[PDB]
Amino acid sequence: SSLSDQLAQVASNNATVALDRKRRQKLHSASLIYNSKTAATQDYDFIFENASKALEELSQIEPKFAIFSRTLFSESSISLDRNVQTKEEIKDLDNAINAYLLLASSKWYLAPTLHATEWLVRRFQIHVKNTEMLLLSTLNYYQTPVFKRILSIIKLPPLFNCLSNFVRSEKPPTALTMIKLFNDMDFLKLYTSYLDQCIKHNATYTNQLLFTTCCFINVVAFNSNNDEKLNQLVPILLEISAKLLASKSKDCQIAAHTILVVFATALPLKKTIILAAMETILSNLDAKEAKHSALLTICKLFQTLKGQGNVDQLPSKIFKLFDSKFDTVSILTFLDKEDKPVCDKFITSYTRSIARYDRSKLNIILSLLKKIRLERYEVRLIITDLIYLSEILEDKSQLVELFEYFISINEDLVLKCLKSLGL
Amino acid sequence: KNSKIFSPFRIIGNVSNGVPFATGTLGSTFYIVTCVGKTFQIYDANTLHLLFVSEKETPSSIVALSAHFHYVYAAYENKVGIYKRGIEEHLLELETDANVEHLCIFGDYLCASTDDNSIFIYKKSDPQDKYPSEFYTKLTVTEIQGGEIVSLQHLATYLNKLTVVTKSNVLLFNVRTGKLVFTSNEFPDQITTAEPAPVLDIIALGTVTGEVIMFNMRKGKRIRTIKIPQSRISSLSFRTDGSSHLSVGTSSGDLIFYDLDRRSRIHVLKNIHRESYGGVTQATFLNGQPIIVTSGGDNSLKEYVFDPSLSQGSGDVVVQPPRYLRSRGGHSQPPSYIAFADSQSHFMLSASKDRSLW
Amino acid sequence: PPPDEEEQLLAKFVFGDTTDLQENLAKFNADFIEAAWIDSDDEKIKVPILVTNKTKKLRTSYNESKINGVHYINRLRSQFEKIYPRPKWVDDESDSNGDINALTKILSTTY
């Protein structure tokens, strides 16, 4: 390539180095709270005193910051520099810095965290060396003056061209532009990596999770047209869904529920994939409002399933698991509620499973079919499995009363099925 | 039947016909050897020029190929030819009646394999010579140990050992004394492709079902199993820039890139070789460079690259999908009409029956 | 005599050593927020080294010139590890009520 371009690359490699006094004054005057002149004049020591006071306040709120007080905020942390050390110690510093940003992600509207992060900014040059974790751990706060300050400071990586246009102005970016950013693809991959590490360190918060799920749902909502784009988007979003369910909080699990339901209604998936997702939900379901959300999204999953084998039964282990996590009286009451999501496909599959697998709770089958109005082909399907259960099982007055209910409702259909097989 | 006015000059405009090609190393560059009909050709790897072509047509069509440094080893019907710069330097008359199927070249040895489970071992004469020339011995593969011979490799760091992969198991041979010294256990499928790793004692077997089986040999206990469904795996290769990338090429014409450290499907290429002409018969990563080269049976040799990533810190999790790069090839079905271009006789128009003109 | 703890502390401060901070960053964890076949001729064999560039790389001391098989192949293993690095997947992993990983498993299966 050309000489000018290669010198531009060497300049980018030497962004951080403070060669002459002009470059030092520039790099120093870049800072977070203070404006130009005052940021230029004040010294590391005064910065570090302010930082230490802020860190004592933060450890008073929560004790996880004794680590950074021990390591990144001491006397050698005054003395040291990035641009002197060997690359492996550099990688260890990047490890500790990313730990800091992850752990301070959940306090960003407080002057204490603001000041300690200004220490990291004005000594470890993080706003030039590793801007990625700064932007991504501070993304959801996208209407706040602290984010406006970081936009006026930072130098963007070539994944963020939208914010790269919005740098250095008076208006915060808009949700449309955020949705452009998340409509990009490699950025989606990078965000999955960050969220994976965040879960595996087990520190998320509600606004963080809410912003993530709203961005993902709008991304799929835009891409409702290009099916090939949805097909290349499936592994990304569903693997973030699987890790998010693997987390142990009600917050994580409910968020993953919303992502799954909007994806399932946006694109018709395969039945085995649907069953695997249900298997994860049931295998990690823990709390009460979690049970509520899980039942709703399971219902919507089987509802948006449409194809051959639409009304097939649950496989055995799945059916045992589902009943065990879902006692029958609870789902009865949920049916008795007023909100009443559409439920016919899933409920018919459930009762056909109870028929072929349980062989006892036909009375509960009777009451469920009492409470909900179903469809014609479903009625014939129920009738088929009940007919075969009659032809095998030793007879029962409960089976008598069930067929009595069907004679009271659609006896001609019953006789049609007997004309298919029987008397 | 001889001629008296004309004489055969060369057969123009071919690259491959589906016989698995080989990659050779000189100094710190590379080159590609392929075979067409009764001859073989040698191409450049940085600009894809035509560097060499054999100068004697063979009495049969060439079936097996491999390459050491300067010499290239070709194997037609019964003999084995040892070529240098396309000039025929040596014959190697085999003492059987069978047809020779696969080939390996390592150390003071050449290992040739026919169809009837017969492994011929040629020894180097004196280590100041460059190719083996003396007949040494003849191992056999009895049917009670394993079925038909599939391929022959040689792992890193095994003194006079040889790796035979058969239909049902793998064998570790000691060629010095001449004893089968290790056998593995029967595998339920038909093993079709083999490749050693850039790590120790690790071999890779590709079956007819979508199983990539990463196998140990110092222990003999298949480490990893990766599944591709609804295809028959046709070749493997490893990346060696320093990432954990594994490249699998099916017969249906796709290409799939996994990562081992993440168990992941990084990417997939769709229809780069036509299944109606034999499928992806040889796909190889060049050693330690972000360059992959594929060759089909549809008379085509392409090579793609991996782009360096767009993250700054994260990197190996956000890897660019491959892009397209150099390519040579010609007709698929035999041509139908030609004509010359001008009175310097330079360009040849030709339109073929797969609906294109070059 | 070795100096005690306060003398160590003052020494580190007044000389401005940063080895403590480096070992602290090193120990920094976001943790908390045989064989089965023998080769008799390989144990019997005696090979030379001094023939050319390759085994003269494999040499270890200046006096030795012929080395037998087990040390030889072990040296070759060391050399191969020098050239091709070892990745963590092959140093560690083996595949060995319903679980959690079923969704990711079916996702990695299907195309």
């Binding site: 994944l159 061209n161 | 390592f106 003071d108 006079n160 767009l310 | -």
Partner: peptide, 28 residues
């Protein structure tokens, strides 16, 4: 403005390898 995708050039850099002709050896 979105992400720009300028696929930059490639250079076949140098490499290093292994050699079976020094894998093998001779009887005593």
């Amino acid at each position: 403005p979105k992400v720009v995708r300028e696929a930059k050039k490639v250079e076949m850099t140098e490499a290093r390898a292994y050699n079976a002709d020094a894998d093998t050896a001779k009887a005593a």
